[PDB]
Amino acid sequence: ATRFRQTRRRRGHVSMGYGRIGKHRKQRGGRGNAGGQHHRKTWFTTFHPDYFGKHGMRVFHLKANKYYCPSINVDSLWSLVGKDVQAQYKNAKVGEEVPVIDCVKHGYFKVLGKGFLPKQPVIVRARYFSEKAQQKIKAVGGACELTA
Amino acid sequence: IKPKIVKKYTGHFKRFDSNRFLRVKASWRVPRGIDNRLRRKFKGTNLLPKIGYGSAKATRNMLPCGLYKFPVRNTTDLEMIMMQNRKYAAEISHAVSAKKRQEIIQRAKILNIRVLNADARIKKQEVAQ
Amino acid sequence: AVSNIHFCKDWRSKVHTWFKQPFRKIRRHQTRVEKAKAVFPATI
Amino acid sequence: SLRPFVTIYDGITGEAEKTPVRLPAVFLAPIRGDVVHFVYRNQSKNTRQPEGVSTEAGKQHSAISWGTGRAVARIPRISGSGSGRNGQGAFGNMTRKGHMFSPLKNFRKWQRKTPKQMRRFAVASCIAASAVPALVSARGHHIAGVPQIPLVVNSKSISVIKKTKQAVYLLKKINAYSDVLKVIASKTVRAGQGKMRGRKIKERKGPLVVYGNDDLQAVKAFRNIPGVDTCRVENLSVLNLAPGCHMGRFIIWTESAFKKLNTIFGTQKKMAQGKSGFRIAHAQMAVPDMKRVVVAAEKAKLLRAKIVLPKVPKRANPLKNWA
Amino acid sequence: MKFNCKVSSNPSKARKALYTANASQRALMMSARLSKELREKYNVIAIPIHKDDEVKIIKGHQKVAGKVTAVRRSKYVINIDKLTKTKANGQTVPIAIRPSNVIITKLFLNKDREALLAKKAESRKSYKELVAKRNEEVAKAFTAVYPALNMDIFGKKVEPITEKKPIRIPSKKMAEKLMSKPTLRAYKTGIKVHKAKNAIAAYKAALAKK
Amino acid sequence: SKDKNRSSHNQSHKAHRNGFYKPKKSAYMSTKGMNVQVLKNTKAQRKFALAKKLEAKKAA
Amino acid sequence: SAPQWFVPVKAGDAKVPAYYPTDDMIQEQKKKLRTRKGAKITALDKPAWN
Amino acid sequence: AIDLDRHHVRKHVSKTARGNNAYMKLLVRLYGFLARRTQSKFAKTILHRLCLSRVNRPIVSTSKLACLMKKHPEETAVCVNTVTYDSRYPVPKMNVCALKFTKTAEAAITKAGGKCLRFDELALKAPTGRKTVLIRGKRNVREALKHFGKVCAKKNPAKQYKGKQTK
RNA sequence: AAAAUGAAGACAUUUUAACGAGUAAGGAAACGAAAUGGCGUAAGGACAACAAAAGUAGUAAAGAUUUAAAGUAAUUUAGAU
């Protein structure tokens, strides 16, 4: 909305809101990220202190598909099936049917351990597990499978 | 009953240097010059519009007859100020024909509503009549 | 934030506008429809 | 949720149908003007056609500035001799026959984007606004003589409409011709430059006839009536329900479209079937009224008494005013 | 509304085709309506005008009847011998009349008007049988759903519905709160105006009853 | 084109417009870089009181 | 009855709306402008308050 | 003239429901009348919070309502904001009054045996506030707060707006 | 700024108190007690005689020249040619 800008409220003012001593000239210190170490150094020092230099080894053709490992914590495991299913099997133990929360179907590969789990047995089928994730699943009375 | 309508300045606020130059019209413009005589309020030339010049709220936008203004374009427009004939006054629009003006004028007398254009766009009843 | 804009090259001749997108849908659809009319399992 | 009964009338015989229909829950959606204004401001621009000036306009010269020392300005000047054009101004936007300020480009942002769930929030707030006679009349619709403000007609009467004389007859029976004749009687010509581009006649808005899947053959009869715009129940949008960003269009529902409203929008407890992921929201308050809580505190003696500001005394001079 | 994509609704394009039209299409545009006596005999509504045709002027200052002496297709006008103006010095000049302001009274029919009028006669007939077939089919569908009623009800007076059933919706309480300030001061003004109109009408009836 | 090098004129007036921002009380209560044994004593007791309090909460 | 603001006036057979009362049931009134009462008259011997 | 410390400028407190929401304007009118007449700090508190901007009205999840009312069973949590659903932990039985309930939040509270009241219902039942627990969400959990300041700072650095070749 | 009242009055509510200079600069729209208030140019979508002929217009449009009125002002309104 051009009618809502400051140009329409600065009609009549000579400098159009830019000052009389310091005019609105073409450049205010260069074109782009100029002077990264000379006159805009204090800007880069203040707001991007690690902009200049090198760090870490070069990976000539990085395979970002090999680093794709979505993770879900234990506290969010039962939300994969539902709250009604959770209450349906809330009184199961060893010997009877226990629902299997396979996480690869939901797009989660590694299961992490954070938060708390409901006091029910469960079978967690996932590609990778954490050391503290397996403890919480087994301490509640469940099992940790593996896939692929 | 009619109050005293008091105006704090009855003149016109003319644009600075409008009298000297014809390209500069008389419609007011606040001078933004860094060395302008008027905007620095020099003695002799310190006449600028201010909110302090505003007239009393009770008697604002009120015609000398003591009533406000309410434009009308047809007879049905008059029906919106029939309850307030002592507060408003009809003002026929400048484009309303002479034939329609008589119908508005006749109805306004019936509804006891004043008309400010009562002698407007009349026929030639000034000479040879 | 350090800006990274590749507009220093002549982008105005690099601009492609999709004004033909609504008419592309009609053109493709009228080819699928007219392909089955030739022989219906042609577009099978 | 009683959802009171809605009567269905017959277009031809004028007889109300025996079995009423419960009011769909879409009519209970919150009526939010601000949300509708957001959606209407965006979708109103989606019909715009690309435009622009010639990219070579004004800059088709080989002009360079004469420099200083010649008692003329430094604006570029046309080259050569033998014509009055030579030595004149050039490309600059302040000159004559030059380019303008930043010339218009055909790759501007004509069409706008709006979230789908926000688009349905406005439509549900625009269908619900058509059941309020105060808003429908305020929009400029003559609905004094209509039997019911959610005007629903029989699907049997619609199915026999094949000519414009019959469609006009139906509109007269349900007293909808008061709004159709208003558009007919007050159709005028456009003001300004718009008539040079073809837009001459400027009509008003009348009833909107919303039909369903089975009323497709009766559309051709309603389309030639001045100031009567038809639409389908599924294709409803703010461009029809709130024309000019004013809500409360006079909608004339058919039996099939009215009975499909609950399927398309669902209720406040069920998600819509024809709109995956959309459910009618609750207003910020349950009963949008304030007197029911005023009398509750009065009954409980929790409020105080109304205060009239005491007349402050004007300052006097005790050294002279003996009183 | 127009639905053909090969024609344009542009006044500028329409006007240009009217000025660049060749002599072939200028004749068809230059058509006049047959009078009552010729319409009944020929069953033809309008035909392009011809030389020596007799017409009567129905619009203009002088509604005289005369003979066509010139059909100027470039000017899109005709000339009538009766309608002439003296050119100041004494000589007279014809006055141009648009072909749409005249009606033909006597035809000039050498040999081709017989072909044209007969062709334009069967054409009118063939359309009536097409309209008649369509009109009765609509009647067949209507009576098949409304056997008691008749097709003639649409051509007569319509009696509206007098019932005024109200519906309780919990939004009429907020109707004034969803109104913008400009459109609320205009809705409330109409409420006040209507009440004052109704108050006087009620008062007038009391005096009339008295 | 010589210039004026430096002046303190109008600098105390500028500093007292939004005056001397005093540090909050949280600045005086920091305990970084304190005595190592004193820090060990405090951590040892805070772990003793915390365990006792959390055990009573666990029992009920 | 008529509203307090409504003072009916006669119409010289000009066009009038359906709600306006006709002339046969309208009786005109004289415009009143005198509201303040005049001074009281007392005996010839008592001095005036003023 | 007169030597003042400062000139009178508008006080930076909102006193009405921002925006054109016809229902939020009604709640402000309802509680502006309640606070004025009853003169209760609760109605004043609710009126003050109803006029805060959206960014200052943070959400409260069912997990936080569950923990806050664990020792307050016969209570009614009052939070002037949207109430979202925490899908990781169970929802107990509780009555909550809030501006808005998420579809998954309202179902969880209703199924557990609780009640989801709006604000016009609470003013009808407990206008002065009698069985209410005032609850507001966390304000410092915003992602914007990370980048406020100078990242070069030695004590509490900022979070370095990402951009060209951010390592 | 604080008190009072508040679905619609109206003058952007009532009362009280303090305040009112200004270059560069800032105060986008909306927000009932409104998080500054408004005038003007053009174009687009609606509204404009509510009883079925619904804004003005050959009983004279727009424009132009002037005479007066309203507004602190930007400007608006009406008369005459």
Place this chain on the structure above:
RNA sequence: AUAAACAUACUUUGAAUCGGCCAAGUCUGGUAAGCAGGACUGGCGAUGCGGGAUGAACCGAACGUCGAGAUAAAGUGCCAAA
């Protein structure tokens, strides 16, 4: 002791600006300068009004539109109010 609730504490975003000049019961270089450069404060810049005849800085005092009254610097032979 005194003052302070439109107090206090701020948070975020951002404009303009860093050519300055003047006074002095002040200082350094210089013969001195309406010269050059500094410490503290107040001003002009950004500022009109009354007085010094006229004056960016001096004296009184800082400005919404007015009516009436005592006043400030300073004046009371005429210009010029006394």
Place this chain on the structure above:
RNA sequence: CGAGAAUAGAAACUCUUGAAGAAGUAAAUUAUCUACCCGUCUUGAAACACGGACCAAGGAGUCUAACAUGGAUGCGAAUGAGAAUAGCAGGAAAGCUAUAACAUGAAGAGAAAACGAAAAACUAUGAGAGUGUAGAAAUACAUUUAGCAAUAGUAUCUUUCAA
């Protein structure tokens, strides 16, 4: 003599001018007081500093793309899916529908290998709700309960040579 208090006491008027033009307003002239050329850079211009003979029309913070803050809006551990694209009625550059790849986010640290979060928390001050007494109209004093937001510090836990 006499304050408080109780009983009785009282104000409605003139003259002049005005459709033979009152009060006010406008224009022109006269008289007293008052008034340096506008815009601009500049510490400072009415300046012997520059541009300006006069008038009309045109005339200069716009568009595209990325990020951030902030005010209104929808949904909310999800949000978007007008990504392409495929269908529907209607004939439609408009409208509607598409269990959908992906974008941001739900988990963070390390250069990388390799990993991947609870003592179901603690302390301090703090928002709200009652009860009683009293001033007594307003409201204040005492007591019981509450712990939100925020700030700060603590134990515990993930990654790092190092938090």
Place this chain on the structure above:
RNA sequence: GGAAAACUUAAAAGAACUUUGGAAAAAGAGUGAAAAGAGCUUGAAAGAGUAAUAUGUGAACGGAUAAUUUAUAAGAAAAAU
């Protein structure tokens, strides 16, 4: 290299005959709803001409306050007992 220049009327009915003049033209006369008269829809400002009115010693113009002149412009009700 490279311009400028749109518009009588509905219809030319584009004055048509006389007097003055070398002629161009002018005055009548006539056409037309209206000269809109071809330098032709309307016709602004800058610059002039005519008429009315007013003023005057080295600039002119503006503002406050009054006087003079001109213009605008407020009414038909009615006392005590």
